[PDB]
Design a protein around this ligand. Sequence first.
Ligand SMILES: CC(=O)Nc1ccc(Nc2ccccc2)cc1
Ligand SMILES: *[C@@H]1O[C@H](CO)[C@@H](O)[C@H](O)[C@H]1NC(C)=O
Length: 341
Amino acid sequence: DLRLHLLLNTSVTCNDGSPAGYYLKESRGSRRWLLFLEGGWYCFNRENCDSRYDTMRRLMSSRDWPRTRTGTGILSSQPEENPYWWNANMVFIPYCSSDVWSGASSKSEKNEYAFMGALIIQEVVRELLGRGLSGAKVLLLAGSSAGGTGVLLNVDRVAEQLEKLGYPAIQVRGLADSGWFLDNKQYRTEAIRRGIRYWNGVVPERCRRQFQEGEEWNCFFGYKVYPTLRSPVFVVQWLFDEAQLTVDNVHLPVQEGLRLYIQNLGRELRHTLKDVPASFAPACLSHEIIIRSHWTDVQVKGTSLPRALHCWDRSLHPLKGCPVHLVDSCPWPHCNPSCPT
Ligand SMILES: CC(=O)Nc1ccc(Nc2ccccc2)cc1
Ligand SMILES: *[C@@H]1O[C@H](CO)[C@@H](O)[C@H](O)[C@H]1NC(C)=O
């Protein structure tokens, strides 16, 4: 169990003005810190944010959150469930800003909702320093789905924040799970354009300077923002991601046209990861992995994801028998026998 703390700075809020927060299970004898960003799509105008407030309210408000959460997968403290970082300090940051962790806009006079995801991350880090993060030696910012994209948008800002607060020794790293999407041709972009204006969304400065005014939406796509990043980032992406296929209007007797479409999507995803040295990409139809209890089961080329992450740690201190770049080459879903059932 991780226990809830609402933010002491109550001006940093969820969508409806209620305080944001974080769940914490500390580990005294450890100097490693894992901050996990929850996912859950997003909303981009008044009417579809209102819809989300009726039937997905816990993603927009803290008024109904429980006092405790169970840590699962990489947030588990048990070595059998979490061979990678079972002894670490564990933090789960709930997603209640509906802005892919990019917003910096208060509730107001002219704003029905607050979109403060980027400021929520910054405030959690600030308040955690007084609870032991000041002694840390590695801070891993991780996340799944919209939280995975949020890692890409925020990892360098967290590094910059700690450097300016006087903590140059804390090594900030990123782990982006299922947040690496393609702006490809559909089988049969305005939502994100149109949300960044609604959220006052912020993107990393170097990527902003490449694409410039009005084109910041480009920085929500992994293969375009990752080359501008400076912190080390490990990328986990299923080759046949279910969220990707949904937006592409694919619904799984597959005939030639769809066969080529699916095979092409795989090969395109594979291509965008060829120059990503730390990555894990199985040939499976799925979505998210790192906080699932059975995340230890999947393997690429004989290496599991917890092992690949351990090899990543060793690389940041070629390694014999301990690889870090693991991308499937077989071209159809399920062609890896270890895929989730
Ligand atoms: C031609 C063109 O613009 N294609 C395109 C653009 C944006 C998306 N957006 C998206 C992808 C995956 C997951 C969530 C959103 C998908 C396809
Ligand atoms: C609380 O957060 C807001 C928004 O980030 C900031 O402007 C304000 O200075 C913060 N208050 C304190 C006491 O840090």
